[PDB]
Each structure stands twice: as C-alpha cells, then as structure tokens.
Paper text:
The eukaryotic replisome, organized around the [name]-MCM-GINS ([name]) helicase, orchestrates chromosome replication. MCM is a two-tiered ring composed of six related subunits ([name]–7), with one tier of amino-terminal domains (N tier) and a second tier of carboxy-terminal AAA+ domains that power ATP-dependent DNA unwinding (C tier). [name] travels in an N tier-first orientation (Douglas et al., 2018, Georgescu et al., 2017), unwinding DNA by translocating 3ʹ→5ʹ along the [name], which is threaded through the central channel of MCM while the [name] is excluded (Fu et al., 2011). Multiple factors associate directly with [name], including [name] and the heterotrimeric fork protection complex ([name]/[name] and Mrc1), which has important roles including aiding normal replication rates and stabilizing stalled forks.
To assemble complexes for cryo-EM, we incubated S. cerevisiae [name] with fork DNA, [name], [name]/[name], Mrc1, and the non-hydrolyzable ATP analog adenylyl-imidodiphosphate (AMP-PNP). Overall, the complex displays a “horseshoe-like” configuration, with the discoidal [name] trimer sitting across the GINS-[name] interface whereas [name]/[name] are located on the N tier face of MCM. Two turns of double-stranded DNA (dsDNA) protrude from the N tier of the MCM central channel, tilted from the vertical axis of the channel toward [name]/[name], where it contacts both proteins. The trimer is rigidly bound, sitting side-on across the interface between [name] and the GINS subunit [name], with the helical domains facing away from the replication fork (left). [name] (13–781) forms a right-handed α solenoid with a crescent-like architecture that mimics the curvature of the MCM ring, traversing the N tier face above [name], 6, 4, and 7. Being located at the front of the replisome enables [name]/[name] to “grip” the parental DNA duplex via a network of interactions with the phosphate backbone and both the major and minor grooves. Multiple structural features contact DNA in the vicinity of the fork junction, several of which require extensive remodeling from their positions in the MCM double hexamer (Abid Ali et al., 2017, Li et al., 2015, Noguchi et al., 2017). This remodeling enables the N-terminal hairpins (NTHs) of [name] and [name] to engage the [name] ahead of strand separation, where they help guide the incoming dsDNA onto the NTH of [name], which appears to function as a separation pin, splitting the two strands of the incoming duplex. We observe two major conformations for the MCM C tier (termed conformations 1 and 2) where the whole C tier swings beneath the N tier, with some inter-subunit motion between adjacent C tier AAA+ domains. In [name], the equivalent basic residue is absent whereas an arginine (R455) replaces the aromatic/hydrophobic residue.
Author numbering:
A (entry chain X): 13 to 37, 43 to 106, 117 to 274, 280 to 305, 329 to 405, 412 to 550, 556 to 606, 657 to 781
B (entry chain 5): 20 to 107, 131 to 198, 205 to 213, 235 to 305, 320 to 517
C (entry chain 2): 173 to 710, 738 to 868
D (entry chain 6): 612 to 615, 620 to 712
E (entry chain 6): 255 to 306
Amino acid sequence: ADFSLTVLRARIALLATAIGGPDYTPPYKLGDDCLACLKDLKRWFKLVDDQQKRWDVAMAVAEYRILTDDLLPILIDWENKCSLAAKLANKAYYDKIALNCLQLLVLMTWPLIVTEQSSSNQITLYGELKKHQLVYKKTILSMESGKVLRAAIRLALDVIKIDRLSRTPRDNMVLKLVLNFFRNVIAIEPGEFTINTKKSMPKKGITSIDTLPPNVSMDDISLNTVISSFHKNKVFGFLLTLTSSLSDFINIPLLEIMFYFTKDVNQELLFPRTSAGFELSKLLQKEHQMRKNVIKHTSARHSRFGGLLSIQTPDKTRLTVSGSQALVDEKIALQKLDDSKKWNKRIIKKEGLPNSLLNSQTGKAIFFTESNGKHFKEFINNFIDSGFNILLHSVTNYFTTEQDRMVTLEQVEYLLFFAWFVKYQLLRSKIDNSADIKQVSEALKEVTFILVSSLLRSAYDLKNWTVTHAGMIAFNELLNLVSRTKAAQDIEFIVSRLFSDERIQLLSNLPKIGSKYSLQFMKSCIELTHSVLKVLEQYSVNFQKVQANYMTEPVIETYINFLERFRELEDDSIKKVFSFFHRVFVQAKEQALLFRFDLIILLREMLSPDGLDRMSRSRKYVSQFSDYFLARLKKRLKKSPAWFVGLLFPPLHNSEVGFYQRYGE
Amino acid sequence: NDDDNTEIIKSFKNFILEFRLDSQFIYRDQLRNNILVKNYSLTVNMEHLIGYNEDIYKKLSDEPSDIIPLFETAITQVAKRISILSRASLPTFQLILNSNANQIPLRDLDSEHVSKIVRLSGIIISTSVLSSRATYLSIMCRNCRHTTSITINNFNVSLPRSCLSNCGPDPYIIIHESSKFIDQQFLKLQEIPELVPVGEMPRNLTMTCDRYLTNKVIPGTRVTIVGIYSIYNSKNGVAIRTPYIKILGIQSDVETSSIWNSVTMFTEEEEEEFLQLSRNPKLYEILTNSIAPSIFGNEDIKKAIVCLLMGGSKKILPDGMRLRGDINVLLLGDPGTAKSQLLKFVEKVSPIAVYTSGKGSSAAGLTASVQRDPMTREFYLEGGAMVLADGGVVCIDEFDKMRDEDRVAIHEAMEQQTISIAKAGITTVLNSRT
Amino acid sequence: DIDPLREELTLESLSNVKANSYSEWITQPNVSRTIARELKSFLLEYTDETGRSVYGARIRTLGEMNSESLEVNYRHLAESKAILALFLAKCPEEMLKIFDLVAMEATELHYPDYARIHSEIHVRISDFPTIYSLRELRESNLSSLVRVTGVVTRRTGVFPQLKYVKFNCLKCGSILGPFFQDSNEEIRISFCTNCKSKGPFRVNGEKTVYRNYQRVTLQEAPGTVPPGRLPRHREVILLADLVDVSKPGEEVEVTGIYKNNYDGNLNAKNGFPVFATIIEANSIKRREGNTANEGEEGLDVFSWTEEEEREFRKISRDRGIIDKIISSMAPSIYGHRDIKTAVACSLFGGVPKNVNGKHSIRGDINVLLLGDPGTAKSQILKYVEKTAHRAVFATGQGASAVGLTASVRKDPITKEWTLEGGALVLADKGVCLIDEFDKMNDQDRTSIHEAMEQQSISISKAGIVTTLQARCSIIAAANPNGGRYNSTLPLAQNVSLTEPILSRFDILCVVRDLVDEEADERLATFVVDSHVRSHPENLNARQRRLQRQRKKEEEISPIPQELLMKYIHYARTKIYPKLHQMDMDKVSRVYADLRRESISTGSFPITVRHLESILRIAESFAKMRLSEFVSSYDLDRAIKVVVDSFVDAQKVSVRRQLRRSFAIYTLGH
Amino acid sequence: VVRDDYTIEAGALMLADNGICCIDEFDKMDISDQVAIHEAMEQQTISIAKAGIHATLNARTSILAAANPVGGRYNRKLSLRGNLNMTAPIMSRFDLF
Amino acid sequence: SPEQTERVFQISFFNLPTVHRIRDIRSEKIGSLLSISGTVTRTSEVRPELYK
DNA sequence: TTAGAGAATTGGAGAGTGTGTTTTTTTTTTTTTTTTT
DNA sequence: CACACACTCTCCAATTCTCTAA
Ligand SMILES: Nc1ncnc2c1ncn2[C@@H]1O[C@H](COP(=O)(O)OP(=O)(O)NP(=O)(O)O)[C@@H](O)[C@H]1O
Ligand SMILES: Nc1ncnc2c1ncn2[C@@H]1O[C@H](COP(=O)(O)OP(=O)(O)NP(=O)(O)O)[C@@H](O)[C@H]1O
Ligand SMILES: [Mg+2]
Ligand SMILES: [Mg+2]
Ligand SMILES: [Zn+2]
Ligand SMILES: [Zn+2]
C-alpha cells in the first residue's frame, strides 16, 4: 500500500517535470510530447479518482506544483500568442494543449464534498486538499493578474464565433467547460475544520480554526480580488453578452455562477442609505458608551480591597456577597449572587453545500473597496436589465420538468438566486426611480410561483430543512414583490388567490417548528410571517381567523428565542418582532398568551443600561410596549391573584379553567 | 543464553588447569600461591592467553565487559578445586591483566575505543578515598517479606521492580547485615609531558580500580594501565556521556613503591647487585660520575647532590625531640653554570621528586592549600609541592625570584619537617620530610 | 522497463524546482539520484588551471592519511555545475548528507574496501564566498550554510556522543528503530511499535555507534568588535574528526550550518517564544597569515602541494639561497642586514637535543634588537608575526608575569582550579615577540627565565603542581637607558637588564641611528619608493589582481612571500641537521678568545650558553639550505654572526682592537 | 583587564579609534603611564598578554597632546628637547611640535 | 525559483505629539501607542522568535 | 392533538494513575590586575 | 516514602428524542 503511494508520487513527479520549463534563453518553452503528457495526466485523474475514489493523484499533483508552474504559464503564454495575432489582424496544434490545460484546471479546481458514500481515504485527505485549492485560487487570480481568465474567455470566443444553430455539441461542451471553470474559481472557499469526538475535550477548546496554507491571507481569496481580476480581464462583459444571447445547454452553469458570487453579499452595503472617518467616529462613540456602562459596573478601588456585604432577606436570614460595587447597588448584589452559581442547565443545539445566506452569521458583511463596489453594482445592474428575466424564465422551465432529479444543491442555488436578485432589484427601485420593478416581472409569473411553492412544500413534507429554509427565504421575497406591485398599481390577485387553504397551514406551521433550528431559520420565518400578515391585512379570506391560526404558544416561543439573541440582531428585526407583539396585545386582546416569565426577564435584559443603547430608535418602542404590558399585568394580577403562578408556568387546556385563565371571565 | 556462558566459563577453567610452559603449570601454581597469602586474585599475561587458544582472546577483546566477569567465575571454580577438599567460603576472585598491546596516547582515545581493552600510560595526579561497592546484596520485600539475594559484578543491574514471589511497584529493601562489599577507588591520570601536542594543556582521565588494585599508586607516580575504555551517565550537551577507564592492571614503571611502610618489596637478584655495589672500593667515584654525566666539572656539587639523595639519619629522642635527617643544598651563582641542568637531573634520579620554579609558585601551592568542595560546600585541604615531594627532593629553581611572602612558607618544612595549618576551621600539622 | 521509483533527471531539470521548498526538492528520490551523479561527475571530471585532477590529488592524500575528511573548495562548484553550489548554500543539512555518500564512492573507486577503515567520509567545504561576524547573523540564515570569524573562548572536553540508537521498551520489544541522533535535542518519541500506546523506555545496549562531540563558545574578534560595545558569541558544535582542532584564544574561521531549537529556559526567562541558536561546524580554518590577501585558499595557509615541495627543493640548491632568503626578510625595510640575518636564524631555529634521555639542550634561537628610535625594530617584529607559523605578540606594561608563562583560573560554577596558558604556551613550537622589553616591570620580565633555556613553565599554585612545555624562540625589542645608544659606554651600562637575562638572548643586535649624507640618501630613496609602491591607488579580477600583486612584490624581494612562508614551515617541520665534528679547533678557539676578551667589566655575558649558540645558528643555516648536514660554510657564517654581534656591543675605545683581534672570524664569510 | 573570567576594558586610545585622542597635562603624566602609548602611536595597535586573555586591539588614533615645561615658563635659552621631560622614543613619535 | 513566503510588514509610527519618561509609565496606558525617552544600559543577542 | 411510555446519548462522579516537592548561596582562601598606595 | 494537583478513564443515571394510544 505505502509503496504504491510513493511509486504514484514518483510517477506523477516525473510526468510533472516532463511538461516543459523556463528555457533560460524567462520565456517558458513547451516540452516535446507536451500534448501526450497532458492527455496522460488527464487519464491519471480519471483512471484513479473515478475508478477507485482515492484523491491521491489529485493530492500529489499539488505537491509538485503542476498547476502553478506549468498549466498557468502555458495558458498565459498562449493567450499572449493569440492576442498579438488578433491585434495584427502551429496555432492549430497549440489550441489542443490550451484546451487540455483548461480541462486539467477544471478537474483540479472541481468542488470537494464529503458524504456517507465518501471513501475512508477521501475523508482523510479532504481537509488538506482544500488548502491546495486555496493556493490554486490565489495563483489563478494573481498570476499575471488574471491573464488565465482572459485565456479562458478566448477559448469560449472560439465557439461563440460560430453560429447558435451551426455549432456542434462538442463545442457546447467547451462553453459548459468555461462556465464550470469560472464557477470553480469563484467557489473555492476556505474549508471547515473537523475534530474527532470519540475522545472528550481537554482543559482548553479548539485553539485555532485557521484553515489556510502558509502563504495565503484571507484577503487573497476574497470577492474583492475576484471582482478586481474579473473587471481587469473583461469577464463581466463576456458573462453579460452570454446571458443575453440565450435566444438551454448552459443555463444551469450560468445560474450557478450568479449564485456563487451573489451568495454572501448582503445587498444593503451596495446602498449607503471624511465619510469613513465620520463612520469610524460614530462607532467609537457607541463603543465609548458601552465602556462607560462597563466602567459604571467596575471597582473604584483595587481588586484586593476586600469589602464584604451581607444581605438580610425574608425569613430574617442572611446571604453574603463580595466587592465594593455590590455594597451600594442592590440590583448588582442580586446579579452577582446569581452569577456565582456553579451549575448550568445543559443546552441542546443542532451536509454537502457551500457557505451562504443559509449558514453565515446575521451580522456578516463583505467589505468591498470603493472601485470594486461600483464595478460589482454596475455589472449586476447590467445583468438585471439584460438577462435575469430570460435566464429565470429558461431555468424555471428546465426544473419544472425534472423536479425529482434535483439533489439539494441545485434546489438551493435556484431558490437563493431567485430571492437575492429580486430583493436587490426591489431595493434598487426603492432608491433609484429609473430602476423598473417590472424588469424582474418574470418572478411573479404563474409557472415560477408554482415551482417555488411546490419545491418548498415537498421539502417541508420530506423534512429537508436546508431546502425549506431556502424556500422560506424565496417565498418571503416573492411576497415582498407582490406587495410592492400591488401598491404600485391581476397577476397579484392570481397568486394571492392561489394560497387560501393549504399553504396557509404550511406557513403557519413554519414558525411553530422554528424554535428547534438556527438563528438564520428563525429570522427567515419572522421576516416571512411579517410579510404575510402585512399582505393579508392589506387585502381585508378572514384576517381575524387566519391571524388566530398564528396566535398560539409555540409561535410566541420562537419569537422569544429569536429575541434572546437581540444583542446580535438589527433594529429592523427587533421592529418586526415588537410589531407582532403589538398586533397580539392590541388587535387580538390575547394578552395572557404573552404574560409568561421568559418575556419579563428578556424585557429587563434589553431595557437595561447594559442592554440596548439609549440613543437607539429600537429602545423607544420597547420602553413604550413595556409600559402597556406592565399596566395590563397589574390589572390582571389585582383582579386574579393566581396569575403569579400562571405567569410562572405554561397555560392550561382543561376547558373552563383554561378559558378563565386566558380572559378573566 | 546461559548455555553460552557455561561454555565460555568451561573454556577458561581449562586455561588455568592446562596452561604450562616447561615443567610448571604457571597459573595453577600462581592461584595456590595467592590463596595461601590470602589475595584472591590472578594476574594473567595476555600473550599466554593468545598462545593457548586465540579464539578466547578474540571473545575477550570483542566484548570485555561481558567476558571478564565470566573468567572471574572460572577462576573461583578452579580456586575451590585446588584448595578445598570436596565432599569432606572463597570470595569472587579478581582477574588482573598484563599486556604488550601498543600504548594508545591518552589524547587519541575516542569513539573507536569505547568498550575495548586499551593499554596506555600517564602520571597519576589524584587518588580518592576508598568507597564501598556491593558484590552481594541480601534482599527483602517491604510488603510480603519474601527474601532473596543479588550477586553483582561491577562491569557496565539494580533493585527488581517486581516481588519475584498486590505486593507493589518497587518492593525491595537491602539487608545491610548480610550483604557483602568491595573496595573501589577513583584515580585521575594526566598524560605524559613529552606526549602533549604543541600548545595544549595536558589532558586528563578519571578511572576506577577495585579490590587488590586499590592503594597500588600515589600522586606523581608514572604508570601504565591496562583497562576497558568505557562510559558513564553523569549528571554534569545532549545524548552525551563521560568516558572513564575500568582499570584491569596497573603497572608502575620503576618499582616506585606506592603506599608503602618501608616493606621488603626488593628481590634477591637486585639486592645482591646492591650488596656487591656497596662494597666496591671506588663507589663514591662511581656515584659522583653518574650524577649528570653530560655536565662538565662541578665535582663538589655532584658530591653534595649524592649526599642530598641519601640524606643523613632521622632520630627520635626519649625527650620526644625529633632531629632532621634530610640535607638541604643551595646552588647560588653566575649565569649558565648548569644549576638548572642539575635540578632537572635530581628530579629524575630521586625516587620521589618535584621540580618547581620560585617565580611560578605560591605559599599555598608549595605547602598546602584550603579548597572548597562544590558538593558538600565544606573546606578541605590539598597538598602542594612539599607534600607531593614528601620523603624525596623538591627542586626550587629561581629561588631568588620567589616573593618574600612565599619563601617564608618553606621555613618550617625545611627544619621541623611539618606544614602547620589553621584556616577555615581546619587545623593540622601535616608531615612533610623532604 | 525502468523501475518508476529509480528513474532520473538532467542538470537542465534540477533548476525547475517544482516543490514547496529546497528541503522538499533535494529529498525526492529521482532528484537525489541526479544530484549524486552530478557531484560525482564534479569530483571525477574537474581539473586545475594547470590541468591536474585536484580532487584526485585530494583523494590520494585522504586514503593514504587514513583521513575521514575530504576538503572541497566552494569556488570549484561556483565555477562548474553552479546549481549544486546554490543548493549547498540554501539547505546544506540535506545536500552534505548526499555529498558525504558521493565522497565515500569517489574514494572507494580509488581504495576498494576503504569501508573497513572508515564507514563514512565528511566533506569540509572551504573558501565559502561570503562572511558574517556574529553580530551580523539574522533569522534569514536559519538552516543555511554560513562562514563566520571569532575567538574560540571556551572549548569543552571531547566526549563520545550517541549516533545510531535503538531503544528497549519497558513493556515489550528490545528493538525500537535505529534513530540517527541530531546533536541538538532529545528523542521525544511518544509511541511504541511493539505496543501502540504511551510507555517508558531505556536506550538499547545490543548495538550503538558513537561519534566524538565537543562544544566551542566562539566570540567576536576584538579588532572587528567596535570599541566600547560588547563582543557577541555563539555556541559552535564540532563532531567526529573536527574535535580538538582549535585551542582557546585563537582567531578562528568556521563554516557550518546555522540552526535553532526550542528550549524552555529561553522562553521562561525572556518571556517570548524565542529559540536558541547553534552553528553545527562543517569546517574550521585558523586566521593566520596577513588576512587582507586573496591568494591564500584552503583550511591551512602553511600547507604545501606536491608542485610546491618540488619548488622548495629546486630553490634550496640555488647558489646563495641563504643571502636570497635573508634579503627577503622584511623586504620593504632597507639595510639592517645583521637584524635580517638574526631574524632569519630565529625564524628557522636550530635542532633541539636529548642525550641518552638524561639531559636536554635548547634548539630555539633568541634575539635582542637593542637600539635607537625609528629604526624598524617594531616593524621587523610585526613582520615576523605575519611570517612565522605559530606566533604571539606582547608589549611592555601590557604583558604580565602570568599572561606570559601560564596562570590558574577558578571556574564560577564547578569552582575548583585549572590552568590557562600564556603567550609562551600559545607560541609553543613558534615565536614570542616582546616589543619594548626594557619597559616591562622586572617582576613581569623575570617570568621568562625558565622558558628561555629549559623551554618549560613549572607552575605550583592552588594545589595544581605541574610543568607545561614552552619551546618558543623569543625575539625582543628594546631601547637603551636615556632612550638613545651611547657608544662610549659598555653594554651593561647602556641597558637596565642584567647578565642572567642578557645571556639567555643568543643573538644581540645593536642599532645606532647615525647621520650620514649618502646612507641617508639611499635610505630616504628606498622609503619614498616604498610609500609610492604601497599606495592603495597604485584574466578575471580575482586572478588579474594577482599579476599586479606579484609584479609589486618581486621588485623588492628575491623570493615570493607566499613561497617563503611555506618554505620556512617546511624547513621547520621536515629538516633536522646533524654535525660532522670537523669544527673542533675553530669553535674552541672562538670560545676561548670570546671568553678572554670578556674580562672587560661591563662587557656582554659570554657563557657556555653562547658556545652552544654558535652550534644552534650553524644548524639554522643548514635548515635554510634545506640540508640534513651542517657544512663548514654554515659553521663559518655562524661564527661570523656570533663574533660580529659580540664585537658590535663593545665601546668605541676597544672596538678597533677587537675588530683587529677577531679578523680571521669576522672576514671568514 | 577586568574580572568577576577576565576581559578587556577599552581605554582612551581605543575609544578614539579612527579619530583624535586629546591628552591634556601631558608633561605631568607619570612616565610609567606615558610609555604605554609607544605602540599605539606608531604601530596603531595595542597588544596584551595577561591572565587568560591575550589579545591585539586597534588604536588607529591621532594624538593631540598639550604640555607645560618643567618649571612652567618655556626657558627660551633652550632648544625644545630640554624644556620638556620627554625622551627621544616619544619625542620622535609626534610628527610636529 | 522556489516559492517565496508571505512578507511581514513592520508598520513604524513616528513623530508623536508627546514623549513620556520611564517614571511616567502607568498601567492605565497598556496597549496604547507611546513614545519613551531613555538611555540604554544593555542589549541582548539578536535572537529568532517563532512567529508563525 | 395532547400526553405518556420506551430508546439513545451526554454529563460528571469518582475512581484511578502519575508527578513533584527539600533548598542554600555566605563564607574563606587563592589568584591575578589596577590603582591608589 | 506521602500528600496534593493534573489529567484520563469508565460507569451510571438524567435528560431529551422518538413512537404509540388515549
Ligand atoms: N659545565 C657545563 N658542562 C656542560 N654543559 C654546560 C655547562 N655549563 C653550562 N652548560 C650548558 O649551558 C646551558 C646552561 O644553562 P643552565 O643550566 O640553565 O644555566 P644555569 O646555571 O641554571 N644559569 P642561570 O639560570 O642563568 O642562573 C645548558 O644548556 C647547559 O647544558
Ligand atoms: N631602515 C628602514 N627602512 C625603511 N623604513 C624604516 C626604516 N627604519 C625605520 N623605518 C620606518 O619608520 C618607522 C619606524 O620604525 P619602528 O619599527 O616603528 O621604529 P622602532 O625602531 O621600533 N623605534 P622605537 O619604537 O621608537 O623603539 C616605521 O614606519 C618604519 O616603517
Ligand atoms: Mg638556570
Ligand atoms: Mg618600535
Ligand atoms: Zn512481597
Ligand atoms: Zn513497547
């Protein structure tokens, strides 16, 4: 076995030196028999990695640098040899080795996944081979500043030059090859760390997550460098002409690319809604206000000064707490008395896909430079105004046929692409008036509404949450679109009529399960529910009956659990929550449904000086809500003293007492 | 492995019992003659071991530390056969080696020699006190109180980690009452002055001898050693360990007598040469011309150096008064007159002597100096040139260039024959009769 | 049909690195095979500028000497197959590990079974093209080859260190695998193959092999250390065949691998993740000669080649070789042929003698340059420091009784006594040069009396009682009383010295700086021309500078200085002339006359040690002719030197009578 | 030479290597201390042999020396060679007076 | 050529508005950019930190 | 749809194993160098 | 030695997950 490994490394290293070299007369020279060495290396990739599921050849071709020292220089020189000739306007031989260099680039750059069906050897090498793919991305983007991306578009031009009808399938294959090359160079992304858990944790945790090779920075791999190298090598102009020329073979690679470099850009950075120094200053004043609150909680003398408090309590008995801060502040004393408890209740906490808006943190933002941010926004604005409408119309047909074949990755990269573009283009048409909304008019067409709704329904029914989460996101965006076009002005009525019985029950069940899943899932359910209720309210089947379908304890639970994360929420998401609590309190007079203790602690923890910022717009309506809540709580308690235990526990379902508890006769 | 040791042992019993030259069984006779006077050792000359069966010398010189202690048991088995009646005890005999293998210069010892029998020579600069090594530990368990013993042979073993028959991880204590021990001594050997390379300080080895080889030397003697060049794991670099010699045979070059209460170590074949020489009618002419034969004239200085080499006679009165028997001589004179060439000669003829320069000297370096031992942190006394030269001659060249504070330290040691000390809480009068 | 793991590359292919580091490239098996064949072909096929196979001549000498070490010159790699010179500088710890095997196979082609004599050869790389002081080293040097200069300041004993080690597991096998041991850190293994868990071990005693080990603390050279700022040091490690190569206090130049390792004491006391650094030495050179010189390659500047020994034999039979060699002593100092003669004799020396083992005679020739100011007494001594094999220089109030001689040190740690050797030990088989000898303290000056005649240093201090050897020739320079020679007085009144030290010197030169209108033209002309010729602004450059250095030197000297340095060391180490005994009447009448005329009160102390001097000087002249036998012409030249130096020490009132009386001996040559 | 191993302590003529050592009160300097500069004035190096520390040191220094006559007044009746306690060995080292 | 590493950049601020003495040092300023005036008594060897 | 019985995984009690700890350090003699004696 | 700390191993029961009938 190990002899086989070292013989494999020796055979591939001897092939790697056979390709060519700098010549030293430096201008890289092709080795004699280079085409046969390239074809043999493709054979090695196939006849080992397909045939035996090993990854060993794909590992050891990185050890001997074949990509960064041979394939890249060969493609970049051939690009110069064709650019010069085009500016002058055996090259038929050099075409074949340029193609085979692109073939090996696509094989080496192909996305890695691990699964139940994965080999014991593949799961061994996975975390390592992600580092070599990171080096390949850095080298492709920076080696002569993306001249290889220019060579890739040239090999596509070679088949764009011959007609949509008069082309051959062996050339439509080359189009798919070039699109798959770009999606790969985009979607090289730093790996997961992984630990074996058969053996328990030592007295420190995982002391570094840092899955990067020795000479790669996190910035060399970022969308900033991707956007930079794409604009400098005219890649965007290629993608834009390509997505307009659609008047089937390539639609799904093209959507894949638009997903892979729209995925982690939260759109709001593209719209601002000395400036960076003013922005830095405001943030330093917020950190100063936080440190002022920490200083108001800190010792006015040294750590050893030693003052000791005794608290008399009912049953005429004592506790004791240390520290000068506790002597004067009764609330700090009781907070310290709870902080010291050495018990904690054990918490309970929660696949082959890329990191995306499903998985990345609510606070995450990617920091475009100012030229990069304008080069990106101008590219996507041209793409929306040209090709989004026809591209969505094409892939929604291809996947309305063929639904059952969509393994979860296709299903996400369709649903998220649909949602992100419709959200961006709604927001552009909010601020810009020359943006048409109706440029994305395809999104509300009956065939696409049916696909999105079917797909979410099947994912919910099959309990595939990653797809239900992506469904909930896209459905929330389609609802935003419907509401906007209704406000602007019959297709609205057709879709709005189309969910009357069953999707209603589904979308009501979604938040009831939400409390079992990630913050991003709960966030999506809340944004969806806010949008639904705002739509159904505006249209009036019966608003009172459908909202009473939502006014149930499990929904209130997921709302409280989303609000527990508030220190990392934004004012928009807190305003959505408290609008729903205002709706429950005033519009329903349900108020007993919210009196449970978890809310009372959570209001105190966020209304505190240590909680929300005092200058925040968010605190103002929390303070207002709390005043109404405490008034109705005082009234209920004065009228029915048993509510002090009823507030401590979940509600009852024994009929007469359960009604009396809920409403006070 | 003990089938293999039994054949090695059987092959050396047969060396003792069969080895003969002429009519005489020289190793059977030497064993018996040593048993009667009660030294339990045998001296073996390695030309005889090669002459009997060269395969045995091959075995011995390939791995000495594993074969020497098999020849010691083969000697004890013969020692019982030739001196006790069977079916009607002796300790483990020492093996001592003589050799004419080529002397290795002390500085040429290196990794090629580790574990080999090595013959060399040097000047003994130091001898330790005697120390006790075990040869038999009696043993008892702390917990279950089982009892046994460990025979020890001192080449390159420790207390067992298991009770031998829970009884525990380190079960054994030593019963000192029933254990048996042997003497061990450390020497330090400097290399010979005429063999030091240009501009280097003379190099030094520590080495160990045991049983009948202890006390066989004194500081300043020139010796040849046969021994096993070997290594020990001192706590005093990395993967590094200290070289020493396990001495197998000291051989003092001139019969300089070592630690010696005037005992009759001479032999009749030289004593009868001396007793004829005494009676030569020209003896004082013969001894005068034998002093520094390459120095012309100076006849009276040669006549006085002969008197100094004999001395007079020491006397001890019923008073308790002690009379000096040693003669002191001063060569005071003009430049280039052979004063220093006569001092460099008396250093070589005298059986004990030290040459020194008064300009290269101190009071403490001449008489005795108080050192501080780095382990105990106690002070201890070390002998200078007058203590090293004791019973002999100290040659003090450049006596006019000695400091006035250093010359005065010699005043007691020239008349009352002692070195008095009162320093660091040590006080003694050391004997020094030179 | 070739084994895929065996197949090889070309010299074209080595440059195309295709690995993440040189460490990873050099270790790949096809690359390693290609490197080996290239290094083999360098040793087999490279030839000198003259056309001889220089590495054949080195391999002859390697196997004949039974030497374990092969000298290779880095320039010979930079001049041929230069990628190997590059890899050797970048990662020597892998490159030398191959070039040691190639050197073993290169010598085994010549001496089959040399494996039975040594299992391994080491390559002592020499003349590495760039040099650092210990202050100039930086992290960018780590794992690279360096060349470095310093003073070896401590030099521990020589110990057997473990090289190959198996281990016993306590649980199971007496056979854990044979680790080659790295000379820097412990074995640290954390595993057992015979039991796949943590457990205790003992170092196995079935097999092991040892190598010699010695640390040397190497410090910056005080003439490169900027004044008032501290000298830096590094630990240096010498392994098998490099141990015992350098003595405490030499200026040494090391080539070696700069390395570093973790140790907790640094990280503890310094409070940062900082690593100790060590130079594993790969060769050593001793910085003797003039050092501002490109023409003097190799680890030993006083070694000769066979084509150099043959050149010594040729010139040694030049008619008048003695007077050519004498004219070449300090060739840029005009006149003073009696001092140049005395310096030549002291610089070659006589023959030391031992008689039946009982008695011994001094072979070194001691010289006193006594005279007026500004007369090249100090320049003659500074020339002999460049020219002699082992030499030490000392001056007046700067030299103590036991900085000459030897002293006893007390260690701060083990804190018991040891010897440190002085200038007369560090110049043993060599010369000690004592400038301003009259201005030493008499307490310091009188330390020399044993080392002049008995050629030993007999210490008895702090319970250390012993004798060191000290066979130096001593050359001393002094001025007379009042700072000027006064020719009407006897010598014993011109000088503050006394008969026991004046008689230990066995040539005396008196220098009088008298005014003369034509000798001061000849002297001033020579000094003016010597400034113009020595001016710092008066076929490739490293060779082309040597034709101008050769041009300028040969205007002044009958013999090249590089040849004369090697000729002197050769004559000192190989040649030991005997006497024919036809001298008896001459030498006896010379001694009788010299003694009879020394009845004068303040006259030079002629003594039996000044008969014995004529015999030493006659042996030194036979060494200059590179003869094993003293001739009657050497006995005449020696009698002329000793009689002229006696007569020149007399007062003008009797110098005429003495020149007239001794004429048969002064005019004998 | 300084201890407690021995080492070099740099003096006034080394601290001024490649520059000027200015010496005042020069005639009032003890002659036993004056002679120590005869190597450093001409051979431009200081060389040493003491305890365990033999050495050779640079002293490439120009000397500027200020002096008083023996008696204060320059005795104009005398050539410079008689006004001043210096002897020919050091009188010949200074380039000009 | 081999691969050549990431470069590490020493950002060297200078010309601060104010200078502190060794006696002005107080733990309240930990982690903040000062300038300090003083006289050197000793300097260590140049040693390698293990940085990454 | 609630609520209650049976199955699987995690927390931490507690048993077991292994390692380090005393600790000092001035004093008194001997030497070799500077300078202030 | 023996007694605290550092650290790993193992078992047991406590809590939460999942399925069934009331
Ligand atoms: N009478 C002599 N017979 C033979 N050799 C002699 C004689 N006198 C002197 N010599 C030799 O000349 C040298 C004398 O030096 P040395 O013996 O050291 O003189 P010394 O008397 O000790 N003089 P000094 O140290 O100056 O007071 C030695 O090499 C002697 O062998
Ligand atoms: N004969 C000479 N030929 C050439 N240069 C000379 C000669 N005599 C002296 N010099 C030069 O003049 C200087 C004086 O020589 P130097 O060796 O310093 O004098 P010195 O004899 O030792 N006098 P001193 O130090 O006062 O006892 C040096 O630079 C010499 O190079
Ligand atoms: Mg003498
Ligand atoms: Mg001079
Ligand atoms: Zn027991
Ligand atoms: Zn084991």
